[PDB]
RNA sequence: GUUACGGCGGUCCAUAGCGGCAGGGAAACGCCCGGUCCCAUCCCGAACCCGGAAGCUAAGCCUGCCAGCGCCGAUGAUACUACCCAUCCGGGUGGAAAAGUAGGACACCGCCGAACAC
RNA sequence: AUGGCCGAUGGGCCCCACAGGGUUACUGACGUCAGCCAAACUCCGAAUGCCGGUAAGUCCAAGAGUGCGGCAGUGAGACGGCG
């Protein structure tokens, strides 16, 4: 019989990210012409979606789950760059050229940093 | 680990009067620290 | 002589006398009680004169409960004064009583003495009242 | 304790509202409603005199067998509405119960006996909670206080109950408190 | 014997100036309030003194979100 | 199309919460190993950042069951009330609470993505 | 803010030290059971009233509304019904 006493670090980190993602979400919103680019980051992968918050539907998505990104010989930042290109091409195929960036509550730097500019250079004006 | 705000951490060795030797780090600038009574030396740790 | 130790506001509008009592209409502590039947401000002294009257008749045994507490103040302007120049200083403390309210409750072994004792208390109250017991 | 249901005749209500209910009272009938596990609210008018008679004899928690337009339904008096001054019965809530059903209700408590001469007996709680079969409900409970001395607390758990009866309320309730009789010195102190 | 009270301010004429179901142009003031009793919604902007106004023409519509009173504007349809 | 799976969102935002019991780790979500590199501590690689996959469902998360604490909550009656009738009492037509009772409830829905079937 | 239950806390007492322990018609917080009160209390919350939309009604007229212009008077009110 083990009764944990304190908060586990995993849930403290999980709750804190949710708390500091809402305060980001006060000003950032998406639209059918300017979809919000939501970023989710994990220790093994990364995920992006184009969300149209008027009706809460996703336009396009990309992630490090796809084996194409997995087969990249590089680093996590190199996988992130490959993801950034992928979402961009899927964005243009859906008819969007300008987005807003929802960094998702993570500090903008490192893997996210590689994600944003890789899509920025690919033609996603934001 | 902030660059300059911290005292310089010196690798040192503990030598005691009983011949016991310990390896650690410390602040002692000499880099070697001596001691007269240690845990082995201390009667309380030996039940004495 | 019951007065509140402190009150947030010392000068207040007169408590209104409309309606009938919604809470405290049934005897809860004792076996007999006095139930009001008309609206009137039962002041601070009338409670004291009535409570003393009960104790004198029941003598030693028994316990008396006073469900009414006079915490609502009333003011009067100083005598021989024209109207105006502000509100008068608070004078006496009253507790607003509506019909159905149970004021006193008395517990005593025998019924006959208890009913007589509560009857004396009624004569010290401005309202027409009746004595009510505990059962249905 | 198995009791026989009391028979009453009830008829449905054509119009409901404060206009109709007031007139119904003026006619000597008390409006009522009937709901239960069957999930079927029915509006009935009982005769005031016979309803009063049933309650006076069988207590407030009376088991009834209503006759609603020729149909016999077993019902229990859930609650009443007594006007504070007139002491009428303005409205009654009736709950249908099947035989052998566990129902939670409140019964009264009476203190019977003769306390020691230097003792004042105070009843803190009038009614206690009880779970029992619909027909096994006791009309009232008894507590005996004879030869009890000093400050002795008769709590709810100490009461003896008929078979098949459970004490839903916690035993910590202090139904009866016995203390030393106040003296004239003590009476003329409290309240000042 | 005198009164030390008797001072009062002007009445500020707060309240809800535009009620639900009314057609409002751009910039019309919807509610005049002191705190954020009413919170801005869609096409409703907050003024300096928490006065609410409209950024787009349409019909007012009061609503709630996350337990907060909100004021919105529905884009009435062009004929 | 299926799943005890990941996300992003909704509802006039607890009927959705709290707690107890049992249960899961395929991809995932995680904890976890380390401080060379971007980056960081009003001291601390704890947090944030970055590099990984040795170990684990014990936590987070998720699934199922509990009416235990909270939450919602009728019909009827009553309080109150607009209008009207009425010589001071009161009454009619319409509206109709709060509390309590019966009960409800251990959430519902939308868009992508996974492992797998096809 | 009434009456109970538990009892810190303090008063007081037995050991007696002023340290450490229990004792009491006492002081009895905190908590809890039962019954209540408030213009400057609100977990709740009507009826009327008000803002707007729509369909009608009166429509040989209420002699209605809105804008502009000429001419004024009024700016000492009273009682009755409701808050």
Swiss-Prot record, chain B:
Key word Flavoprotein present in the record?
Answer: no
Question: What is a GO molecular function of this protein?
Answer: rRNA binding
* Record flagged with keyword rRNA-binding: yes
Q: How is the cofactor bound?
A: Binds 1 zinc ion per subunit.
Q: Which GO terms describe its cellular component?
A: ribonucleoprotein complex; ribosome
Q: Which cysteines are joined by disulfide bonds?
A: none
User: What cofactors does this protein use?
Assistant: Zn(2+)
GO BP terms: namely: translation
Q: Which UniProt keywords apply?
A: Metal-binding, Ribonucleoprotein, Ribosomal protein, RNA-binding, rRNA-binding, Zinc
The residues that hold Zn(2+) are 16, 18, 38, 41
Q: Which family does it belong to?
A: Belongs to the bacterial ribosomal protein bL31 family. Type A subfamily.
Q: What does this protein do?
A: Binds the 23S rRNA.
Give the record's subunit note.
Part of the 50S ribosomal subunit.
Q: What is this protein called?
A: Large ribosomal subunit protein bL31
Species of the source: Mycolicibacterium smegmatis (strain ATCC 700084 / mc(2)155)
Whole-protein residues included? 1 to 48 of 75
From Swiss-Prot, chain C:
* Top-level taxonomic group: Bacteria
Tell whether Ribosomal protein is among the UniProt keywords: yes
Question: Could you tell me which Gene3D superfamilies the record lists for this protein?
Answer: Ribosomal protein L10e/L16
In what ranges is there compositional bias, type Basic residues?
1-13
**What Pfam families does the database record attribute to this sequence?**
Ribosomal_L16 (PF00252)
PROSITE patterns assigned to the protein according to its UniProt record, in alphabetical order: RIBOSOMAL_L16_1, RIBOSOMAL_L16_2
For the biological process aspect of GO, one term held by this record is:
translation
- Quick one: a GO cellular component term? cytosolic large ribosomal subunit
**Alphabetic keyword roster:** Ribonucleoprotein, Ribosomal protein, RNA-binding, rRNA-binding, tRNA-binding
Which segments carry the region annotation Disordered? Answer: 1-24
The GO molecular function terms of this record are: rRNA binding; structural constituent of ribosome; tRNA binding
Reported function: Binds 23S rRNA and is also seen to make contacts with the A and possibly P site tRNAs.
State how it assembles: Part of the 50S ribosomal subunit.
Per its UniProt record, what PANTHER family does this chain match?
Answer: 50S/60S RIBOSOMAL PROTEIN L16 (PTHR12220), LARGE RIBOSOMAL SUBUNIT PROTEIN UL16M (PTHR12220:SF13)
Tell me its family. Belongs to the universal ribosomal protein uL16 family.
Supply the name of the protein.
Large ribosomal subunit protein uL16
Organism of origin is Mycolicibacterium smegmatis (strain ATCC 700084 / mc(2)155) (Mycobacterium smegmatis)
Curated annotation (Swiss-Prot), chain E:
Determine if Ribonucleoprotein is one of this entry's keywords: yes
User: One Gene Ontology cellular component annotation?
Assistant: cytosolic large ribosomal subunit
- Its domain of life reads Bacteria
Q: Which GO terms describe its molecular function?
A: structural constituent of ribosome
A Gene Ontology biological process noted in the UniProt record is: translation
Q: Which SUPFAM superfamilies match?
A: Ribosomal L27 protein-like
Keyword Ribosomal protein included in the entry's annotation: yes
Q: Which keywords label this protein?
A: Ribonucleoprotein, Ribosomal protein
Q: Which residues form the signal peptide?
A: none
The Swiss-Prot or TrEMBL record describes its family as follows: Belongs to the bacterial ribosomal protein bL27 family.
Q: Which HAMAP family match?
A: Ribosomal_bL27 (MF_00539)
Q: What is this protein called?
A: Large ribosomal subunit protein bL27
Name of the gene this protein is made from: rpmA
